[PDB]
């Protein structure tokens, strides 16, 4: 299948990006930086892992948005997108090959970010009994990939729309502001003002509308011990579908990325 054959390019194009190796090293040295300063200030594991998960609310979009904002429109300025459509491909095989090909980059970024950091934590206590950490970080490594795969797909929606690489970053920095640090911040003020005509108890029953909160919802499941994340503790839904809506924010966003790719 040729969807893997375009993904061998974007894996090789992603690893030779100079900025992407800089941020993923900066992700990994801050991955141990919460880990070393969370162990030397302690003596445990789930108390500091929310601060570890709060690091990945910033950088795992910013790894994904730096990697994939110039995938569709970055090949349209180069003209190779017009060349690739003359090649024996579907339109969707370009996008799904870019989504797989950028997808194994940042899957390998958290395996070099968290994987050194979590195995350093097991080699800094020696009596944490490291087999219980596999149920902790294995619930955490999968969600970090599943977070950034949404932000890969949100990058492909914006990069399908715009016509130049310079205005692609103006939407790429816009979505990283809006989803990470604005859409939680509006819900702080929406708690304190919305009580007369719009009841705030009925507010978080359908707060699937920000996946980085769902990234923070899965990483405090059973390990709460917060702020805006206490509103998800009022959910009567189980946490198993809190996985499944985050996987649903890939396929809703990829279908919007596929339909915008057919309008070029």
């Amino acid at each position: 299948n040729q969807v893997w054959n375009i993904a061998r390019k974007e894996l090789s194009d992603g690893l030779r990006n100079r900025w992407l190796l800089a941020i993923s090293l900066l992700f990994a040295v801050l991955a141990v930086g919460i880990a070393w300063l969370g162990a030397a200030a302690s003596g445990s594991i789930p108390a500091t892992i929310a601060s570890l998960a709060s690091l990945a609310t910033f950088l795992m979009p910013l790894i994904a948005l730096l990697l994939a904002y110039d995938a569709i429109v970055g090949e349209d300025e180069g003209g190779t997108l017009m060349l690739l459509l003359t090649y024996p491909l579907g339109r969707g095989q370009i996008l799904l090959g870019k989504f797989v090909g950028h997808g194994l980059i940042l899957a390998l970024a958290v395996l070099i970010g968290f994987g050194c950091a979590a195995l350093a934590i097991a080699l800094l206590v020696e009596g944490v009994e490291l087999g219980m950490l596999f149920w902790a970080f294995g619930r955490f490594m999968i969600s970090s990939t599943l977070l950034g795969w949404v932000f890969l797909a949100f990058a492909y929606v914006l990069s399908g729309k715009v016509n130049e690489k310079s205005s692609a970053a103006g939407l790429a920095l816009g979505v990283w502001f809006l989803f990470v640090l604005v859409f939680d911040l509006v819900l702080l003020a929406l708690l304190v003002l919305s009580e007369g005509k719009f009841n705030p108890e009925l507010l978080p029953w359908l707060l699937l509308l920000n996946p980085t909160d769902i990234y923070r919802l899965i990483n405090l499941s059973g390990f709460e011990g917060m702020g805006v994340l206490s509103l998800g503790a009022d959910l009567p839904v189980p946490a198993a579908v809190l996985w499944l809506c985050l996987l649903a924010w890939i396929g809703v966003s990829l279908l919007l990325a596929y339909a915008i790719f057919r309008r070029r």
């Binding site: 040729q2 054959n5 375009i6 061998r8 390019k9 090789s12 194009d13 030779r16 990006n17 100079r18 090949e75 180069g78 003209g79 190779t80 017009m82 060349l83 690739l84 459509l85 003359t86 090649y87 024996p88 491909l89």
Partner: protein, 307 residues
């Protein structure tokens, strides 16, 4: 045979950006698509590809529809001003494209020698020139056994030695039975290597034929400088009463400006005196025909100096 276009037309909204185009193409004949203000310099060029759909009629590339992958495996294409993925190496860029077109990987190192890029292989695409990228964009079009090439300005930024043998590479290919389509704006330099022209403007086809056909079509004069012609007077006046202009150049040379409908029979009259003595004919070129057919399309000329 290779490309057959039966009366198609194209519209973005309801305005016809291409109107009533009817082309044909043989298996070895190369074709120069020339347009400057009509959209059919590029929207017909996308219509040979599967990039657009024929909204009025239908096209046939190698007897098939142009969206089949069996068509595109034997179809090369080179766009204008293409820059590739600049952090990626040069040899793996072709090794990316050979996996996509289904070409064998043994062809990759041959084609980098065939475009002269082996000294510049295994380097980044950002440290390439304009024409050094144009060798790379040529080389992906030669992948497999490409029956049809579409070259939109293939010689821009190239070396002057590298321009000429590229046409000899094309003349290698059209003698091998693979017809190409050229799309240039620089008209001298493709006119020595084109086989028939496809000049069109204002969204419609103006004229299609050979360069001998269009000078037979357009009334357009030639300049026949015949050096060394003896006796100077009776061979001068004999073209003036025959409907032509004979320049009385005083260095024993008679320059006849004719109408080229009687082209060869004055040329046989130029061997009728026995001493033609290294004559020179100045046919009107491709851009001289391009100035004609805009007036046939109604595009007016400029002032005495504008552009």
């Amino acid at each position: 045979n290779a490309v057959e276009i039966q009366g198609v037309s194209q519209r973005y909204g309801s305005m016809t950006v291409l109107h009533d185009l009817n082309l044909n193409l043989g298996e070895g004949e190369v074709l120069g698509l020339f347009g400057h203000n009509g959209a059919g310099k590029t929207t017909s060029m996308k219509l040979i590809l599967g990039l657009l759909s024929p909204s009025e009629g239908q096209v046939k590339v190698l007897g098939r529809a142009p969206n089949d992958p069996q068509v595109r495996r034997q179809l090369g294409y080179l766009p204008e001003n293409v820059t590739f993925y600049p952090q990626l190496s040069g040899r793996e860029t072709l090794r990316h494209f050979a996996r996509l077109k289904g070409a064998a990987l043994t062809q990759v190192d041959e084609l980098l020698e065939q475009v002269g890029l082996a000294h510049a292989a295994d380097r980044r695409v950002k440290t390439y020139s304009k024409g050094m990228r144009q060798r790379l964009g040529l080389a992906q079009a030669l992948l497999g056994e490409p029956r049809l090439l579409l070259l939109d300005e293939p010689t821009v930024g190239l070396d002057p030695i590298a321009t000429q043998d590229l046409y000899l590479l094309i003349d290698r290919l059209r003698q091998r039975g693979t017809s190409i389509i050229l799309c240039s704006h620089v008209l001298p330099g493709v006119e020595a290597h084109i086989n028939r022209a496809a000049i069109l403007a204002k969204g419609c086809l103006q004229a299609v034929g050979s360069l001998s056909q269009l000078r037979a079509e357009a009334g357009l004069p030639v300049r026949i400088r015949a050096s060394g012609i003896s006796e100077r007077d009776s061979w001068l006046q004999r073209w003036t009463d025959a409907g032509h202009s004979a320049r009385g150049l005083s260095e024993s040379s008679i320059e006849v400006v004719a109408v080229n409908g009687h082209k060869l029979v004055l040329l046989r009259q130029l061997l009728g005196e026995g001493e033609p003595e290294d004559i020179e004919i100045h046919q009107p070129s491709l851009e001289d025909l391009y100035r004609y057919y805009m007036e046939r399309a109604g595009d007016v000329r400029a002032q005495e100096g504008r552009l």
